[PDB]
Amino acid sequence: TNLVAEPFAKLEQDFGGSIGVYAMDTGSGATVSYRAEERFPLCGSFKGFLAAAVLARSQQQAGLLDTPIRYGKNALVPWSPISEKYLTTGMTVAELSAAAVQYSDNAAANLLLKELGGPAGLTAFMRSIGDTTFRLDRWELELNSAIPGDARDTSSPRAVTESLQKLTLGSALAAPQRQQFVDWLKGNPTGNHRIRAAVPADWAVGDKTGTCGVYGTANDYAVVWPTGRAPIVLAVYTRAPNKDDKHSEAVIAAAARLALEGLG
Numbered sequence: 001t002n003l004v005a006e007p008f009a010k011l012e013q014d015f016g017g018s019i020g021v022y023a024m025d026t027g028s029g030a031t032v033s034y035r036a037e038e039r040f041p042l043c044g045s046f047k048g049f050l051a052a053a054v055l056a057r058s059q060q061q062a063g064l065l066d067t068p069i070r071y072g073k074n075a076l077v078p079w080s081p082i083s084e085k086y087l088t089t090g091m092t093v094a095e096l097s098a099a100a101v102q103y104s105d106n107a108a109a110n111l112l113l114k115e116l117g118g119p120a121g122l123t124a125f126m127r128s129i130g131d132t133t134f135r136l137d138r139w140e141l142e143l144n145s146a147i148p149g150d151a152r153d154t155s156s157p158r159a160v161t162e163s164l165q166k167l168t169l170g171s172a173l174a175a176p177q178r179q180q181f182v183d184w185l186k187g188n189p190t191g192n193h194r195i196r197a198a199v200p201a202d203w204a205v206g207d208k209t210g211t212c213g214v215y216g217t218a219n220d221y222a223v224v225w226p227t228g229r230a231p232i233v234l235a236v237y238t239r240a241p242n243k244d245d246k247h248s249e250a251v252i253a254a255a256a257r258l259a260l261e262g263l264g
């Protein structure tokens with residue numbers, strides 16, 4: 001309503017851009033929504049769903065996760081801190097997935113996209129779990145352009161949350177794969193100033209961040225496990241009108257706090 005939305009509008013007025021938020025209490029079904037069906041660039045946040053798509057494919061292809069990917073130096077793209085170190089040996093699909101999630105490794109992401117049939121393959125996986133909003137159209141690094149009006153490489157806060165719920169808490173992944181995905185998100189160290197900063201320290205959190213680097217466009221989605229309560233799933237996405245507008249981790253954390261504090 002208006003008292004739900006009012007603190008969000010104030011926050012994005014001070015931020016100088018747009019904030020999109022969706023949070024779901026998986027026990028009661030209560031939600032908090034703000035610009036939740038608007039499109040925002042995914043940036044690197046797609047890499048979480050990328051790892052989930054790989055895990056799901058391993059349910060149909062036994063031993064996919066252990067497949068060695070031996071790549072050449074030209075497979076490397078900027079911001080590939082893990083894959084650059086294994087150029088002389090190669091990495092398995094599961095090792096690449098861990099790097100894509102926890103270090104946002106770009107070469108790892110592109111290698112896994114290639115295994116799935118390109119960006120179209122990741123989009124097809126998201127369609128397979130009932131996500132009709134998600135679209136990945138381009139590769140790293142071009143998908144980070146975040147140009148105003150462009151629907152390529154975007155989703156909505158609601159669809160991100162709904163798909164994250166299906167993959168981490170629903171039946172989309174088998175228990176071993178589900179455990180693996182949750183562990184990668186929980187061990188992610190790139191989001192300490194985003195959704196995690198809004199959550200009490202004793203509550204476990206798994207997240208995946210995105211930071212396009214332009215147009216104040218950055219994001220985070222997370223599963224939150226309140227002690228002995230039903231988990232929460234939420235997504236916080238930002239963008240801004242000017243190419244050199246700075247993203248704000250504080251704004252993401254503040255919006256996350258508002259959403260978590262508003263759940264019935």
Ligand SMILES: C[C@@H](O)[C@@H](C(=O)O)[C@@H]1NC(C(=O)O)=C(S[C@@H]2CN[C@H](C(=O)N(C)C)C2)[C@@H]1C
Nearest residue numbers: 043044045079104106144190209210211212213
């Ligand atoms: C490739 C970039 O656009 C970005 C993305 O894919 O969204 C990369 N992914 C992220 C992200 O935010 O998920 C990062 S690293 C992140 C920001 N810097 C943190 C860090 O490790 N530092 C050393 C500051 C973690 C990179 C900027």
